[PDB]
């Protein structure tokens, strides 16, 4: 494993695609906000639905999230405030309304 790495993050938002580099040790949401991007959030701690998105391409680490159950992780759900990229990723944002619980 490299000590450090950078990953291309593409966010498909309701109003456009936005893209940015994200370090291996920076959450999706923080890397987006570093580039002026407006995403939904609240707790910023991985324990709610505000920042939910759907993984479309690549792989994510979500050790730091606690709200999504294993079934939801297997459905492609992502808490963008608690997810690190481990590859180039594409994520559809603003998806909280699709969650059941
Ligand atoms: S804002 Fe609450 S889990 Fe991300």
Residue numbers in the entry: -3 to 97
Excerpt from the paper describing this PDB structure:
The noncanonical amino acid, para‐cyanophenylalanine (CNF), when incorporated into metalloproteins, functions as an infrared spectroscopic probe for the redox state of iron‐sulfur clusters, offering a strategy for determining electron occupancy in the electron transport chains of complex metalloenzymes. In conclusion, we have incorporated the noncanonical amino acid, CNF, into two FeS proteins, and in each case observed a small, reproducible shift (<2 cm−1) in the nitrile stretching band of CNF following cluster reduction and re‐oxidation, which is consistent with an electric field effect from proximity to the cluster(s) in different redox states. We also obtained high‐resolution crystal structures of CNF‐labeled proteins in both the oxidized and reduced states, demonstrating that site‐specific placement of CNF caused minimal structural perturbation, and giving a precise location for the CNF side chain in each protein. In the multicenter hydrogenase, DdHydAB, the nitrile group of CNF is 12 and 13 Å from the [4Fe–4S] proximal cluster and the [4Fe–4S]H subcluster of the H‐cluster, respectively; the fact that spectroscopic changes are observed at this distance confirm that this functional group has long‐range sensitivity to redox changes. These investigations lay the foundation for employing site‐specifically incorporated CNF to probe the redox state of FeS cluster‐containing proteins by IR spectroscopy.
We first selected spinach ferredoxin I (FdI) and incorporated CNF close to the [2Fe–2S] cluster. Mutation of Tyr in position 37 (Y37) gave protein variants with equivalent UV–visible spectra and cluster reduction potentials to the WT FdI, while variants at other sites gave abnormal spectral features. Therefore, site 37 was selected for site‐specific replacement with CNF, to generate the FdI variant ‘Y37CNF’. The Y37CNF FdI also exhibited a UV–visible spectrum and reduction potential indistinguishable from the WT protein. The IR spectra of Y37CNF FdI in the as‐isolated state in solution show a low‐intensity but clear nitrile stretching band at 2236.2 cm−1 (top) close to that of free CNF measured in the same buffer solution (2237 cm−1). Crystal structures of WT FdI and variant Y37CNF were solved at near‐atomic resolution for both oxidized and reduced states of the protein. Superposition of the structures confirms that the cluster environment is well‐preserved in the CNF‐modified protein, and is unaltered by redox state. Site‐specific replacement of tyrosine with CNF causes a small change in conformation of the side chain relative to the native enzyme. This shift is sufficient to alter the crystal packing, placing the CNF side chain in a slightly different environment within the lattice relative to the native Tyr, however, comparison of the structures of oxidized and reduced Y37CNF FdI demonstrates that the redox state of Fe does not influence the geometry of the side chain relative to the [2Fe–2S] cluster position.
